[PDB]
């Protein structure tokens, strides 16, 4: 697998690329700026700037931005999490010259027309009025609120309608001018790109970007609404983090676990996270599932089996992202790797960290993170038969 | 903190510490209690 080569410019912006023989490319800008860096007075600034970022910059007033990136034939894209913001373009490699200049405008020289600001406010607000339809997102934005009470990690990416309505260009300008620093930025490219050409384009454009205790609280939120047909319940404990080595032995544990829609998640933030399971079931069976889940976590903690570990190591092995997955998937990995680890971890190092995992250290790490821990519980729907906190806390351990 | 991680976190060990402690507690309680009763009367 070709190595990911990283350079660093005056601004501090990093320019990471991983050349591949695929023909198109996914060039993106990552920024270490999310809802965790907001201070409850600008709780929707990143989301609303993510809406405003494609509505024209000085150089591209009006629909120019979308038009050109449309003409070139590039499906631009963007997203915001609690810690990272990404603006990426998938385009024919030859178009890097413009895929990069366009990205430069989007990060700097952007224009937040107040007129547009008004509309985006309405857009965000109205969607939020309906964002309630995404029960799962709701469950996961409370599994965050009740687990990180009193911290900037409880607040959602979208923010409360309140802030959305109460936001102005200057505020946005601040978030833009405060959390868009060049040392906190990665220009990532994946696919048919040359690293020297991309470095020269980053020196030509984007060389102007200015250079400048999270806690988990074992708790419970229960939103009871009996008119909903199905119930969604998420139970999590404190994830190790992004950099913690044991994350890998925890991923194998998730691969061992894999009622209904019983997914499993290991969400990681800067030295924190949520490790757990989300399941949707008919109200009458919520109790059973919650118990089954526990029994399983407990199984790994005291009774793993090399065979199953293997099953888990292999599934993890087929999850690692690679040139095969495509440019975007890879870029995305390049941007997150340079933002979180500070380097791109190659797949050989991932394979080494997977093959060093055995059953004994898996049950040791699972006992470190699951056994006798206070979970965060978030339920939405007909959740009366969902057990309260003593029964779940008692199910977090075995007498035997 | 060490104790929790050593004798109070694993339920089996929790029982062990309880049983062993109780085994000795009687000795101590009886002894101490008797001292008091005698002193009183």
């Amino acid at each position: 697998v070709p190595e990911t080569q990283v350079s660093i410019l005056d601004n501090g912006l990093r320019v990471a690329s991983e050349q591949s023989s695929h023909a198109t490319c996914t060039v993106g800008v990552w920024i270490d700026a999310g809802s965790r860096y907001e201070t409850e007075k600008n709780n929707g600034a990143g989301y609303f700037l993510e809406h405003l970022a494609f509505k024209g910059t000085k150089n591209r007033p009006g629909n120019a931005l979308e038009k050109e990136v449309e003409s070139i034939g590039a499906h631009l894209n963007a997203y915001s999490t609690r810690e990272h913001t990404a603006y990426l373009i998938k385009a024919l490699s030859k178009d890097l010259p413009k895929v990069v200049e366009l990205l430069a405008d989007i990060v700097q020289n952007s224009s937040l027309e107040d007129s547009q600001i008004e509309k985006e406010r309405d857009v965000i607000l109205r969607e939020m009025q309906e964002n309630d339809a995404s029960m799962q997102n709701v469950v996961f934005d409370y599994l965050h609120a009740t687990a990180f009470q009193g911290t900037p990690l409880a607040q959602a990416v979208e923010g409360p309608s309140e802030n959305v309505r109460r936001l102005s260009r200057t505020d946005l300008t601040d978030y833009l001018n405060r959390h868009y620093k060049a040392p906190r930025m990665v220009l990532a490219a994946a696919g048919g790109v040359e690293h020297q050409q991309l470095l020269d384009l980053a020196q030509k454009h984007l060389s102007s970007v200015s250079r400048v205790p999270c806690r988990f609280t074992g708790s419970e939120i229960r939103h009871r609404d009996d008119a909903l047909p199905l119930a969604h319940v998420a139970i999590a404990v404190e994830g190790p983090g992004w950099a913690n080595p044991d994350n890998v032995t925890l991923q194998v544990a998730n691969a061992i676990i894999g009622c209904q829609s019983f997914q499993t998640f290991n969400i990681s933030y800067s030295d924190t996270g949520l490790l757990g399971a989300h399941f949707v079931c008919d109200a009458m069976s919520i109790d059973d599932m919650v118990f089954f889940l526990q029994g399983q976590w407990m199984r790994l903690c005291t009774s793993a089996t090399e065979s199953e570990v293997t099953r888990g190591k292999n599934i993890l092995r087929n999850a690692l992202v690679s040139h095969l997955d495509g440019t975007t998937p890879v870029c995305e990995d390049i941007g997150r790797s340079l933002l979180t680890y500070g380097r791109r971890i190659p797949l050989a190092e991932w394979e080494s960290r997977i093959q060093e995992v055995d059953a004994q250290m898996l049950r040791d790490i699972c006992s470190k993170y699951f056994y006798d821990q206070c979970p965060a519980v978030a339920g939405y729907g007909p959740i009366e038969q969902l057990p309260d906190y003593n029964r779940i806390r008692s199910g977090m351990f075995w007498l035997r | 903190s060490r104790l929790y991680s050593l004798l109070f976190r694993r339920t089996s060990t929790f029982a062990l510490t309880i049983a062993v402690g109780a085994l000795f507690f009687e000795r101590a309680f009886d002894q101490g209690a008797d001292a008091i009763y005698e002193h009183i009367n």
Partner: peptide
């Protein structure tokens, strides 16, 4: 929606360690 309000304050209840607790 689900973000309109934030978790109520438990300051009078919260105790200002887990292993010990």
């Amino acid at each position: 929606s689900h973000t309109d309000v934030k978790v109520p304050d438990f300051s009078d209840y919260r105790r200002a360690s887990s292993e010990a607790r």
